[PDB]
Symmetry: C2
Subunit: 685 residues, 2 copies
């Protein structure tokens, strides 16, 4: 044997065999991170008596850092803030960690309504770090250095081919797989096909709708003005013309048809503006599509920024009038049209992250959670069936309110008017949240109601023209299966409309949600059918809908050029300027290169999806419900038969597994080359 | 095309395609679990004020359940308790979640010393019924069908054990029962070198060898007497100290009388478990194979007053017309020795030597060294959320699990924690820990192992020792580079405002007088190396394969379910049925509970925590004392760790063929 002392001497005395620079950081050692935040004064300061003095120790943020180090630092500080929220929510009795018996009367005192003066729709009143009265956003701004190393970054470029090459080289390996890649895996990520497909199977699949006759007539007139006879004939024919309408952004912000969307970002030295500014731009875009009989959604027209009418706007029409159409200009080299698609993507980033995700799943659900906790006692069937879908939701939403919206979304959006905003009330991101919350319709977003209102005959169509809409096909199935389970459970106790109407809690529950919760579209439940649909909607909102709009966040956003949050240059002044656009015009509009603080925009655009990500599923739920109701004797509860709950859970489990097979078929049944849709695989939701 | 409405109608209207009973529960939906605990009154009760009234809602625990459902419920409630501890430790400022600047004077007020009236060595003063909550999750009775303890034979539990295996990564989800010859002399002895307690075996003193020479003379075993007289590499695992540790006389037996409770009230029904202050004598052969020669079941002052059995097999290669499998007296002896190692491992090697020793140093560090200091910055990352987990362990693991399945008693539950022999064993182990003697180089030398310089290959089956010599040397090198960046001479140490008080705080309030009076750079480096060793690789070494070595209970049970044999004569008559009665096998004598808790303990002690992640993190912050030196130290440490990782593999593969793997220190394991 060569003895241990010789193996030790040989390792210490020889040159290094392993170069640490060739081994990128994947995880922060949590203890080293906490020490470094403290060393850099990115920490709460205290008086001698051990209380917080409301300040941070540091006057200014980090001088210097790396892309990878900052990205990981942002995830780490967010996950720390989420841990702090859980701890505070435990301390305050909002979400106890160890189970505690609380009479309803105690819960009415614990769970209060916020008053709206924080700029948010009504949520849990939050009264350690959560003990003060928006400085937590200053701590995050300090983690983003003044400047970073631009070498071997995803934004460096300086060309699109350069960022594409870098993007591909970062993929691991040789549903699980899809998560750790992005749409840039496709060389034709920019294509009409993959652009339009996102409106059916991307992170925002539930807002595309049938174009009204009024809208089609606007686009008929605009095509007449541009002398485009072919596209005018397609619209006049009017065969399955669809719209993604983002024109409401102006109504939502109180912006006039003369005002442009601009975010003027002020560089800060601590709290003090340096005078250096960065401008980002948004657009209330409109996309017109045609759904072909073969199932392929084709984009026909994009209005960059809809300003009251098409007469007062810039509308470009696709050179290609069907999916297979050709012309002497390749899709890759059609820069005016690629610019238009990129603008429409910025619009969908806003609608997705603010409305479809934050409002429609988190803030709507929080009102219902608070209302439920205040009105329905913990012993009740209604509480037992809803509450498991709400585990640690209130604490995560508190973290999101303090950091995500003001610190990230308000920064990379192009609505402004300024970042940081001195007040919430001038800030267009907050107005968009307010408007989206006020204009959410709880019953219209019941899956069967939603699909019909948006003009999709998913129920009965046998043409196969919805084969590229797996969100809709999967959701029709999944809703029906969740409703079946809710039906079996609810009817165990609620044997007639009379039992609903005489219920001590349901009446007050609906009123609490409608008034204090400010969801007047929540039903006044007087029937078993209404009770089933409301409960189905709550479970849908909490689990599969949230999964659908969140699971592939990283896939669709992390390669920023495919779906940027905002434009880095002004819109073209008129249609003439747009038609002259080249590769350089689209590149300048994207956060590519080492100028104009664009590294920060790329970092935060790629980071947001990560912050919203990193057995929380219906199968685990079903097995768990089955298990406790196998263990229950029949005497225990008298309002419902727990053997029926056991039966419902067994049924639900099997129905979910069966549906999982169909979700696969609907994904594989898409037209050749279409991106996979594995987001609802039952042990995913 | 067949539309969605038809696929929905077809799934709802058809018989179920999937039977949920054929899909075992692996994860609790956390919300359903919390609701069910609340429904069963397994929850804290409150006054109108919203305050805790100190009681649980439920007066009695669950009536009925399954082995698998209870096991999963125990892990789930423990992980909840750990979350609650983190939340409390955040609330009280003990371990803030969000970073906060605290002046030293504030920290002296936050971090106080416990006074020992809780029965524990000195620890953090925190500011019970939480133990009653866990006892309620264990039902009064369970379903015995398709359980690992049912048996009723050893072959039956062996068959069940093997069938439950799934599919370093692999080793985790299996156990020593994967080997048909788990009971063998080879795999028994090997655990003293590469099991969960590899750091207590030692060179046998001349006095001890002379006792065993005399006992072999009494039994007329000429061959074994000649081997001992020759005295070539005779090693000892000595557990005789259990009597000194508990104040037990040589006339008293170790017994745990377990009282059946209806809520809190004894029914009068009891179950007995038995422990033994065993001694194992081994010979290390030149080829590296550790061979067990003799086991004293329970050492009671002398061998004259004890029961000592000597192996029929005098070398590893020996064959007797009685196969190892059918040598029930010897298999019984090995099983008794295993109970002794369970206690020494879980109490001393794990709980005291890594957690409680470390906690004193953490408290002392927080009270004396300000957060700005290099000493605080180098130590504190290795202590992330340790204080909260230790509090959970003090409230639940020791009184509720370890004191229940151990055979020391005198009774479970104990009204008086100071009168409980498990707590006396903790106290004794803490008082007799030698901080400087457990420096790896000091430890190997004191226990009589020439790991440093040996070229015979006789330590090829001691990968813990070989790996640790390397790893200690590498950690020390990193600590050296970092410490010397500020501590440029002994003078800078001696003039340090904090180090003097730090040492005194640990020695007095911390009750670790073996902690050095640090007046030199070399002493400072070794102390800091020891803290990092204790926090990371030593802890990993004694904890990582806990499940592998304990979860198949017959291979290493926590206690005996029957009394020891009366005398050597009785022991030599033992059969398969005698060993089986001693193990928690079958549906009688509450043995299902012992198996459940024995297999559960390792799991509860398991719920990128490594030196590679640490090194890369330190390197990265020091890309932006001379902090370029810290960057250099971290780069060096990273590379040295990777290089060592290759050697750890070689030392594992270099073991005599068929020896169990040792992947416990693979640098992204630590
Ligand atoms: Fe979310
Ligand atoms: Fe441990």
């Amino acid at each position: 044997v060569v003895p241990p002392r010789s193996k030790l001497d040989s390792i210490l005395s020889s040159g290094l065999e392993h170069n640490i620079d060739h081994d990128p950081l994947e995880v922060w050692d949590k203890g080293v991170f906490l020490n470094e935040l403290l060393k850099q004064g990115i920490a709460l300061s205290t008086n001698e008596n051990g209380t917080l003095d409301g300040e941070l120790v540091a006057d200014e943020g980090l001088k210097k850092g790396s892309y990878k180090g900052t990205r990981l630092a942002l995830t780490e500080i967010y996950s720390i803030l989420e841990d702090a929220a859980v701890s505070h929510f435990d301390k305050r009795g909002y979400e106890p960690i160890f189970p505690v018996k609380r009479e309803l009367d105690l819960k009415k005192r614990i769970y209060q309504w916020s008053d709206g003066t924080d700029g948010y729709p009504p949520h849990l009143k939050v009264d350690q770090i959560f003990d003060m009265q928006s400085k937590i956003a200053q701590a995050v701004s300090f983690i983003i250095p003044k400047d970073i190393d631009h070498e071997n970054t995803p934004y460096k470029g300086p060309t699109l081919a350069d960022v594409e090459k870098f993007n591909k080289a970062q993929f691991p390996k040789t549903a699980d797989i899809m998560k750790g890649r992005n749409i840039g895996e496709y060389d034709d990520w920019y294509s009409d096909a993959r652009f339009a497909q996102q409106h059916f199977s991307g992170v925002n699949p539930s807002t595309i709708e049938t174009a009204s006759q009024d809208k089609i007539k606007e686009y008929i007139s605009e095509a007449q003005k541009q002398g485009l006879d072919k596209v005018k004939a397609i619209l006049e024919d009017g065969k399955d013309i669809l719209i993604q309408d983002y024109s409401y952004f102006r109504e939502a912000t109180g912006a006039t048809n003369e005002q442009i969307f601009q975010n003027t970002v002020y560089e800060l030295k601590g709290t003090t503006p340096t005078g250096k500014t960065t401008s980002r731009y948004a657009a209330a875009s409109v996309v017109i599509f045609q759904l072909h009989e073969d199932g392929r959604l084709h984009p026909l027209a994009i209005t960059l920024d809809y300003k009251g009418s098409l007469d007062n706007s810039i509308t470009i029409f696709n050179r290609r009038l069907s999916p297979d159409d050709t012309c002497d200009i390749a899709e890759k080299e059609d820069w005016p049209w690629r610019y238009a698609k990129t603008v429409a993507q910025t619009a969908d980033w806003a609608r997705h992250e603010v409305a479809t995700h934050l409002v429609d799943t988190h803030m709507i659900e929080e009102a219902i959670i608070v209302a439920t906790n205040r009105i329905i006692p913990e012993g009740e069937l209604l509480y037992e069936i809803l509450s498991p879908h709400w585990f640690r939701t209130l604490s995560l939403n508190a973290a999101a309110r303090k950091l995500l919206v003001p610190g990230v979304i308000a920064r990379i959006a192009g609505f402004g008017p300024t970042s940081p905003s001195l007040d919430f009330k001038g800030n267009n991101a907050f107005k968009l949240i307010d408007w989206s919350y006020k204009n959410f319709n709880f019953q219209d977003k019941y899956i069967p109601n939603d699909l019909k209102k948006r003009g999709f005959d998913i129920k009965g169509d046998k043409s196969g023209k919805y084969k590229n809409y797996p969100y809709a096909n999967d959701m029709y199935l999944l809703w029906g299966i969740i409703r079946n389970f809710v039906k079996t459970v609810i009817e165990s106790q609620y044997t007639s409309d009379h039992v609903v109407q005489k219920d001590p809690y349901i009446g007050g529950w609906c009123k609490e949600i409608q008034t204090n919760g400010q969801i007047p579209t929540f039903p006044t439940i007087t029937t078993v059918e209404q009770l089933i649909d409301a409960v189905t909607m709550c479970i849908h909102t909490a689990s599969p809908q949230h999964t659908a709009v969140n699971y592939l966040q990283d896939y669709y956003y992390s390669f920023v050029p495919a779906k940027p949050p905002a434009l880095c240059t002004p819109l073209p002044q008129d249609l003439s300027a747009l038609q002259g656009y080249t590769e350089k015009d689209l590149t300048a509009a994207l956060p590519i290169g080492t100028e104009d603080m664009k590294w920060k925009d790329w970092l935060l655009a790629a980071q947001l999806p990560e912050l919203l990500s990193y057995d929380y599923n219906l199968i685990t739920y079903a097995k768990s419900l089955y298990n406790v109701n196998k263990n229950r004797t029949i005497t225990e509860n008298t309002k419902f038969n727990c053997k029926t709950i056991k039966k419902a859970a067994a049924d639900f489990y099997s129905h979910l597994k069966s549906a999982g097979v169909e979700f696969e078929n609907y994904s594989k049944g898409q037209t050749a080359g279409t991106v996979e849709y594995p987001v609802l695989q039952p042990e995913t939701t």
